[PDB]
Design a protein around this nucleic acid. Structure first.
Ligand SMILES: Nc1nc2c(ncn2[C@@H]2O[C@H](COP(=O)(O)OP(=O)(O)OP(=O)(O)O)[C@@H](O)[C@H]2O)c(=O)[nH]1
Length: 664
DNA sequence: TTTCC
């Protein structure tokens, strides 16, 4: 089954992905690199006092606060869903190798027993229904841009001036490009408007993966993360091998002299795809209006913020099932892409825009550097984009693509297993829409809250309920997959968008509460995804602009965990053991410094406020803006705070652009 | 200078 074309950096096909400037050339050549991160200023992730601290802390908590999770996967008691060994990683040092992106997932999906299209007319109706509800009656907004992000292929600029320039130009030429594409003239489209080429595969860290402590061994054991080699990825898993990356940290002593305590490992690595910006611009301009619609009209199932926000919806349920999906992104079906593109055409969207959109979801990928002596290889032909990688991380609508898939999938699961008496209501398109419209507002007997694959599925009182409980039982035994479309299962330790649902002895939603995930406080504070980048002097451009600020939001975020107090205390104690410092002091110090330095970037303060008008959301986002693109959205952040991190584009120009794109 | 709501 179609092997994918592969090209080497040397090849003209690859050469043309990188413009004649130094940054772009350097991107194409970039080699496997690694090294201890600067966890906080002047502190390395492998500093022996720090590692000693992680050894003591991690053990102490695992010991005194073992997970309270039932059978079932509801958490109770202490609010701990797992051990605390997650912090035992040499942050900045990757597992070897990273995976190669699969060029085609059709086999992956076939072997997994997953449908290659809607299976029943009902589902086909519901998927198109979801397209219609989401992409209709949209309100124009200005295209926002992360400060310091890359335009990737082919210029690799972080100059806002140049980004705005590119974006604006892209909205003008979007139409010619799509039409060109409609004519099969992809190369022309890429050469004239930089729309096409490929994704740039950047490997990012997941600093905290599973590590258990073997009862029989006494040795810690790292979770095995499976990865593909070149052959696997090009052949969709026909040839080649799929195997376990090595997290073994011993190489760290031999190579770099670094001292490696027992039970510490190299970090997991997630592949990440950077989009050609000229192509993503036209897409983001529409994606954001769509996000806006769903978080307004279908706020029930889609718009989540405060822990009380979630609790209010769920407490009304008789049953709450916490699902989750395995490797959602690599599994995501291209048939969905096509269907989405189809109904969008039927709604009367611009054919040339649906074509841009379509293409963005079948684009080749530039594989950079999964390992030493590896990478620098283009997968797929940009002349005729035909890759089926699943969902490309930096596509511009990837949250929405995920949401579309999983929201319907989930509803379907509910129907199939719990609410047959509901099918008579989904006869045609209009009836389907009205049903979906109702379902999403939370007006039916089956309910759902979700962001992409993370969901909690809900049953009120009624006929579905009994079915609900069986579904839940089906999910526990785990012998049979409840969906035709994706591999679904119950979360072992139920939690939604970061907050744990804390059940009491009743084990019912009614007497359940949302508290923060204490383990997340730890991951965030001692195992950050990036270093502090103290070389970057413009902090709005740093991955972690104002680390110290999280101290001020700690109480609001995590103060509701049953063991909050005890955890801060254990830290203090272990930190004193390891540093002869008050950890608390060191934070309050850093809180102060970053608070001053902030007034600089928010002239709209600007010192004298003091931490002022800032909500907890702001404070966590300032310390970690990576929370814009998974947890919170625009209108959850104060407007003068947004403009520190983001930058807009001529509203006239988006407004003009949108108009030529949409039906009405 | 490293992509993603
Ligand atoms: N919000 C948020 N999510 C994270 C963070 N780190 C990891 N994740 C999420 O954790 C999820 C783990 O997904 P998987 O790749 O399937 O790992 P897994 O849940 O163990 O999957 P299985 O191997 O099937 O058990 C990812 O999809 C991420 O979205 C983080 O720092 N913040």
């Amino acid at each position: 089954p179609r092997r994918a074309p592969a090209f080497p950096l040397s090849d003209i096909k690859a050469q043309m992905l990188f413009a004649n400037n130094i940054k772009a050339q350097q991107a194409s050549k970039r080699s496997f690199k690694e090294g201890a991160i600067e966890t906080y200023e002047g502190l390395l992730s492998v500093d022996p006092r720090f590692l000693s601290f992680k050894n003591e802390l991690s053990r102490y908590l695992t010991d005194h606060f073992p997970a309270n999770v039932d059978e079932y996967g509801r958490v109770y008691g202490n609010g701990v869903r797992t051990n605390f060994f997650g912090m035992r990683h040499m942050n900045g040092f990757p597992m070897i190798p990273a995976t190669w992106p699969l060029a085609s997932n059709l086999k992956k999906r076939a072997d997994a027993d997953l449908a290659d299209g809607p299976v029943s007319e009902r589902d086909n109706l519901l998927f198109r229904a979801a397209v219609r509800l989401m992409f209709s009656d949209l309100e124009p907004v200005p295209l926002k841009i992360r400060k310091g992000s890359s335009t990737c292929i082919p210029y690799f600029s972080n100059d806002m001036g140049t980004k705005i320039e590119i974006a604006e130009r892209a909205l003008e030429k979007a139409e010619e490009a799509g039409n060109l594409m409609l004519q099969g003239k992809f190369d022309d489209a890429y050469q004239l408007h930089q729309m096409g080429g490929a994704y740039y595969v950047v490997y990012r860290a997941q600093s905290t993966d599973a590590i258990t402590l073997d009862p029989k061994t006494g040795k810690f054991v790292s979770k095995d993360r499976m990865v593909a080699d070149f052959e696997y990825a090009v052949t969709g898993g026909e040839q080649g091998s799929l195997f376990a990356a090595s997290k073994d940290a011993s190489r760290l002593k031999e190579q770099y002299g670094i001292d490696v305590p027992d039970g510490f490992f190299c970090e997991r690595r997630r592949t990440a795809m950077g989009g050609p910006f000229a192509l993503n611009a036209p897409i983001m301009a529409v994606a954001q209006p769509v996000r806006n619609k769903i978080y307004s009209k279908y706020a029930y199932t889609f718009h989540h913020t405060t822990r009380l926000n979630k609790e209010e919806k769920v407490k009304e349920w008789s049953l709450c099932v916490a699902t989750d999906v395995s490797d959602h992104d690599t599994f995501w079906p291209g048939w969905l892409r096509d269907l989405i593109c189809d109904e969008l055409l039927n709604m009367g969207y611009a054919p040339w825009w649906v074509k841009l959109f379509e293409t963005s979801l079948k684009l080749p990928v530039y594989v950079g550097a999964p390992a030493p002596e590896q990478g620098h290889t283009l997968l797929g032909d940009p002349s005729n984009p035909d890759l089926e990688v699943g969902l490309s991380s930096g596509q511009g609508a990837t949250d929405l693509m995920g949401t579309l898939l999983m929201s319907i999938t989930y509803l379907v699961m509910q129907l199939d297993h719990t609410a047959p008496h509901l099918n008579s209501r989904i006869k045609d398109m209009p009836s389907a829409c009205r049903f979906l419209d109702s379902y999403w507002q939370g007006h039916e007997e089956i309910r759902q809250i979700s962001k992409s694959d993370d969901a909690m599925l809900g049953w009120t009182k009624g006929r579905a309920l009994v079915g609900g409980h069986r579904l839940f039982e089906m999910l526990k035994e785990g012998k049979v997959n409840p969906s035709p479309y994706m591999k679904i299962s119950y979360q072992h330790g139920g939690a939604f968008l970061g907050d744990i649902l804390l059940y009491d002895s009743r084990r019912e939603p009614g007497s359940a509460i949302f508290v923060g995930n204490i383990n997340s406080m730890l991951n965030n504070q001692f195992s950050p995804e990036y270093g502090v980048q103290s070389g970057v002097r413009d902090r709005s451009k740093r991955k972690r602009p104002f680390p110290g600020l999280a101290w001020a939001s700690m109480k609001d975020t995590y103060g509701a965990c049953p063991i909050y107090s005890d955890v801060l205390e254990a830290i203090e104690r272990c930190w004193w053991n390891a540093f002869g410092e008050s950890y608390r002091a060191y934070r309050e110090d850093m809180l102060k410094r970053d608070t001053l330095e902030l007034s600089r970037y928010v002239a709209s303060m600007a010192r004298q406020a003091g931490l002022a008008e800032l909500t907890p959301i702001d404070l966590e986002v300032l310390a970690d803006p990576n929370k814009l693109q998974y947890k919170w959205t625009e209108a959850d952040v104060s407007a003068n705070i947004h403009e520190v991190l983001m930058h807009g584009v001529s509203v006239e120009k988006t407004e003009r652009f949108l108009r030529s794109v949409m039906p009405r």
